[PDB]
Design a protein around this ligand. Structure first.
Ligand code: CL
Ligand code: CL
Ligand code: CL
Ligand code: CL
Ligand code: CL
Ligand code: K
Ligand code: K
Lengths: 379, 358, 358, 379
């Protein structure tokens, strides 16, 4: 009996079993509907300071493997599941999930009614919480920490997970057959895109590479000037944790790029920043979107795509400056999912075209970027 | 889980292959794979309470028989799998014979070990924490009762005492991401209940027939559906209870409330417990609900239409033979014979030919 | 490990009980239980080279035999335990039937698994590292050859190749806390060798006959003891190789150096390799060392006394007859048969009664 | 493959398997011939700063249990074994050896030729060493750590393992039927003994309690004065790690006790201190005595006791002051095993009468102490 307990800001308690590291974890508690891809979710920087609840009951069936890592580490503050399986059963498995969590020092609880949890979050909106896994978990203590959490609203977390120094990436996507491929030689990549590291998934990077890009990842805080100084064929605004609003640096830099003709493409946090830099406004959603079965329609093409989502903030359609045209919307709630600068070659998508985990449906957004890129090059 | 009927086809090859041989199917919903499986097992209407044993622990040839059933799947495979774990084979040895993914095999092994514990500890060791554990893994009151050597009703009372009852979750296509107004439900041993029953209406519950099998088909289901459509049309709140995934009775449009559950005494009483219906119909689902009638009434369920006693009077040959007599009707000459030589004579009495019916 | 002789008592009950029925015993020493156990099996003189299988993997009935053998031990139980693991039974399962502590059972299981790998990788997979690890677990070159489908000699040349030879440790009553001057040794696959053979003496090695069994008793040991006593007394450095723990021959006082080892070609050759004896005596320990003569001589071992050739001439039914023919001595009528109808005819020639020697 | 390596100051390397924590350990290497009692041995404070090698090849056969803990923790700085068996197999087991070591963050290595190591220790005498368990163990590094280790000679470790504050000890010995008893009530114990904690084994304490003794375990450095004001029925000097010679504070205090008429009893380290306080001299042995089959002769009675031993230093017999008479000598090597003050009610034994692990043969030395206290009580 290795107890664990989760408490939400509202006082709700869920008692279950510790399945990862001993300790405590505090963050905003969110639910994710993905039936597969827990590893990828766990390792997505966007999950920084968030407690991840997975609605699919059996989490861990296939164990874990290095290829399934979205970053160098597990960003999730903690993990909430209904059942950890007895065994992992998959040829790609290199380590069982409990071992993995422990190894990454993650506080995780199993055996709780995740449904009740999801229902509460849906109904009453997101809540901050705390998990204590240990000998005799203090429920009063957990509540206090939950209540003492500052919250993600107005919290800049991009600066917190960004790389320290700029780096070069030239590695493409995995294949069943060849796994993760060797990094390409710079000369084999026609384009050179400069990527803003706001807590980037490796998959974004790999998919850009697959399309002919060679990249330079730069810290969140890079200046426009240093950026422009590189003479990129395009600029990329990665996905990333927290409130996009506070990232004044990014916004400024961005505004800076928009004065030029360099194609700019943002994904998720990148989508919100572009929007902000364009004069739009962002909002914190009631509970946001985390799942991999989310329908988004390309309104310009009247077509639906099933996509991967992982965001708690959104761009207000209503405050859209005139130079921003709406390109996609959520079919589940009508929220804004895509925009394109009417006057500039800058566009972004709220969802995650790179998926990992999730449907490959939105991959094509990447192609528009290349398109833009090549066009800028024609010039 | 598929429903077979090999017993009606003597000389048939009863091994499973690429050509279907099943005559029906049952479905179960559980928060876990073990809970789901077990519920399905008790819903199959083959008389199993879950992993009931096929061979004896003390049989010198059991491992050989077990081995054969695993290697060359029959309709009984699943039971044999558990038997294998009780006889000593490892997960790996089972895998090797069956090719069934270890992820499933381990769950069944874990259930066996839990059963061995119940058998050891007995009813005395069935404390609240353990029983709840057991319930969460989908063990049925009837399976627990056999292991602990008591009656099903005893496990049933124990749960009452501890206030250990399932809760109901709703089916909704989106893992609770959006709300729902359809009352399409399944039982589970969790915290929060989503049943939210009306206090408003007079309800009528119709019990389904479970998976289809030879002699218990779609015809029973048509009647269930009709009970539901007519009564709803009339103003009653209709509650359907069945777990045949193939049917119209299990379409959430057919009734006001659908409980997609095994049609067993345990499952039904849990529903009645919380629904408090005006009446329950046990006459439209075939043999399945027919057999629960008396038990249901004993437990105080408000059964409507022809009485359980009445049903019995007609279903019991002896009881039936007297009513016919009473009525002065005509029935063919009959006789209950025990011994062979007792028949041969009695036979002379009745006159051939004869309809020998065990 | 006890040595039995049921085959000579055809009508006897052969299950093991509280009244002893064994006729001898072998003993082995190893740095680990696995090494020790394997050494004992191969020195038991029952034709085993380790855990040679008893039943076939593709016998539908094997699990039944295995079950019986585990449940009611006979002399071969040890072998059926490894058949059980090969057949997918678990440690718990074997435990339940035999009551043998799991501490021991998991080790046997672990060995079965290494054997599976050998069979799978074959000789090519017998790389230096895997080969070391196997040897360290007590695997005989002969068992390895078997699983890899080669000649024992190939496993041996290969070890030779990787310079993979055991080292010798000494018995000292005290776990190395004090030094010893006695040379009572055993082989192991460890680092440091404590043999330190002399370079000073003419050595004579005497080969014992392993456990006692009917027809191979104490008489053979007395002979071996006398050879040791006599030659030591005459000035030779005597080396005794034996593993019967009950006799005078394995008393460290009996010879100058004692190797408490299986009397097998493999174990003997490792010894001859470091000792470089002047002569080896194979005619005193009975059958055991006698059957090793040809192979020892083929390997370069200096066998003294009557040549393996001469021994075979006597022992060779056909060879002998010529010699008798040659010496013009009298022998009884005799012939080789193949067939029965042959037999009948020959018998006819020879005359009855007859001695029918298989 | 989980690597581990043992390197001795002489440079000899032992390549094996890590079975405990990842990391390094430095200490003096000793060998112990106990075929049973590995846990008790590990948890003996006397082993502070030493890397213990067990000669019996299979260590871990019975797993581990709390009742077999001779102290709050594992003092052994490292463990060296030939084989860690597949499973633990004993009714009393609550955790397998590997798990336990890991638990206690002990670096341990298996699969080495412990016999080769024992022969070297025996022939060449004690040596310091280092175990490195990790990805790629650095031999050179290990060698240096072993070389830089200062050595136990001249090393006061009692001060390093003693209790911070004084405490009452009223718990008795374990039994098969009852297990460890519940601490007695002070009132159920007739005598009052002040026990100096130099890194005392629970068994000693338990055994005294079994004899009627109520305890107050005081810090190694406790003054004689502060002790005396306790009006103790007798004073007990515990066993412990390192060199007894540098515990000036204890020698002094002892000196003081000896001026009085209170009964004094020491075990192992306590025996050495007694002798020092009496003006005798200690010396470090070649390799020392560590085992459970050591025959000791009671010269007075001419009887032999098989005993448990764990000591690297010894009291020189030749330097023995006349007021100390020789009561027991080792039959293995003639070294000093017990002494008795001719003028005072003070005695001591080099061996461990409380065993744990070991034969129970020397438990009667405990009795002698009891008579003395009683007779001092008569007075
Ligand atoms: Cl819960
Ligand atoms: Cl329990
Ligand atoms: Cl007999
Ligand atoms: Cl290998
Ligand atoms: Cl070594
Ligand atoms: K729970
Ligand atoms: K080694």
């Amino acid at each position: 009996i290795k107890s664990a307990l989760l408490v939400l800001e509202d006082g709700t308690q869920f008692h279950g079993r510790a399945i990862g590291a001993t300790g405590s974890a505090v963050g905003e508690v969110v639910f994710n509907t993905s039936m597969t891809g827990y590893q990828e979710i766990l390792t997505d920087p966007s999950y920084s300071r968030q407690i991840v609840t997975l609605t699919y009951p059996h989490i861990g069936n296939v164990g874990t493997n290095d290829a399934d890592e979205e970053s160098s580490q597990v960003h999730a503050q903690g993990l909430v599941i209904r059942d950890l399986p007895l065994i992992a059963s998959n040829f790609r498995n290199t380590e069982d999930l409990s071992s993995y969590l422990k190894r990454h020092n993650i506080v995780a609880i199993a055996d709780i009614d995740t449904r009740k949890l999801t229902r509460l979050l849906r109904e009453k909106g997101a809540q901050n919480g705390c998990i204590i896994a240990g000998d005799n978990p203090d429920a009063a203590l957990a509540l206090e920490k939950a209540r003492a959490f500052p919250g993600l609203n107005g919290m800049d977390l991009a600066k917190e997970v960004t790389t320290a120094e700029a780096y070069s990436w030239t590695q493409g996507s995995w294949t069943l057959t060849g796994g993760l491929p060797q990094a390409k030689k710079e000369d084999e990549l026609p384009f050179h895109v400069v990527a803003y590291d706001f807590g980037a998934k490796r998959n974004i990077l790999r998919m850009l590479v697959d399309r002919g890009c060679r990249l330079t990842i730069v810290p969140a805080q890079t200046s426009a000037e240093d950026v422009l100084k590189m003479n990129p064929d395009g600029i990329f605004l990665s996905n990333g944790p927290g409130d996009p609003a506070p990232c004044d640096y990014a916004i400024t830099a961005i505004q800076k790029f928009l004065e030029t003709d360099i194609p700019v493409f943002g994904i998720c946090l990148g989508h919100q920043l572009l929007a902000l830099a364009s004069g739009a406004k962002t909002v914190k959603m009631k509970f946001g979107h985390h799942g991999g079965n989310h329908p988004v329609k390309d309104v310009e093409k009247n077509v639906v795509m099933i996509t991967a989502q992982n965001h708690g903030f959104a761009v207000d359609e209503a405050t859209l400056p005139a130079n921003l045209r709406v390109t996609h919307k959520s079919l589940f709630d009508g929220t804004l999912q895509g925009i394109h600068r009417t006057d500039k070659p800058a566009f972004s998508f709220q969802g995650n075209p790179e998926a990992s985990p999730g449907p490959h449906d939105a991959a094509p957004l990447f192609d528009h970027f290349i398109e833009l890129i090549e066009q800028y090059r024609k010039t | 889980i598929p429903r077979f009927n090999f017993e009606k086809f003597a000389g048939a090859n009863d091994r499973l292959t690429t050509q279907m041989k099943s005559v029906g199917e049952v479905m179960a919903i559980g928060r876990t794979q073990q809970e789901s499986l077990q519920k399905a097992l008790r819903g199959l209407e083959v008389g199993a309470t879950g992993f009931d044993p096929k061979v004896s622990l003390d049989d010198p040839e059991a491992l050989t028989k077990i081995r054969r059933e695993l290697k060359d799947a029959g309709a009984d495979r699943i039971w044999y799998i558990a038997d294998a774990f009780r006889a000593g084979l490892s997960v790996d040895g089972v895998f090797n014979l069956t090719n069934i993914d270890r992820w499933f095999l381990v769950q069944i092994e874990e259930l066996v070990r839990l059963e061995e514990k119940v058998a050891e500890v007995g009813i005395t060791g069935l404390n609240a924490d353990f029983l709840r554990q057991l319930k969460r893994k989908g063990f049925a009151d009837a399976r627990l009762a056999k292991l602990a050597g008591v009656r099903e009703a005893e496990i049933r009372k124990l749960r009452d005492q501890y206030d250990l009852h399932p809760v109901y979750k709703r089916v909704d296509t989106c893992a609770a991401e959006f709300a729902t107004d359809t009352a399409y439900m399944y039982s589970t041993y969790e915290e929060e209940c989503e049943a939210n029953p009306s206090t408003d209406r007079e309800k009528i519950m119709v019990l389904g027939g479970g998976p289809n099998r030879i002699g218990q088909g779609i015809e029973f289901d048509y009647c269930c559906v009709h009970a539901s459509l007519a009564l709803r049309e009339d103003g009653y709140e209709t509650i359907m209870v069945n777990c045949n995934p193939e049917t119209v009775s299990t379409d959430y449009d057919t009734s006001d409330r659908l409980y997609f559950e095994p049609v067993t005494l345990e499952d039904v009483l849990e529903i009645v417990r919380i629904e408090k219906p005006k009446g329950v119909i046990v006459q439209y689902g075939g043999q399945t609900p027919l057999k629960l009638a008396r038990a249901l009434e004993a437990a105080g369920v408000p059964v409507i239409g022809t009485s359980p006693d009445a049903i019995d009077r007609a279903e019991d040959r002896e009881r039936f033979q007297h009513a016919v007599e009473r009525l002065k009707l005509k029935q063919p000459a009959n006789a209950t014979v025990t011994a062979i030589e007792m028949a041969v004579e009695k036979a002379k009495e009745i006159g051939y030919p004869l309809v020998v019916r065990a």
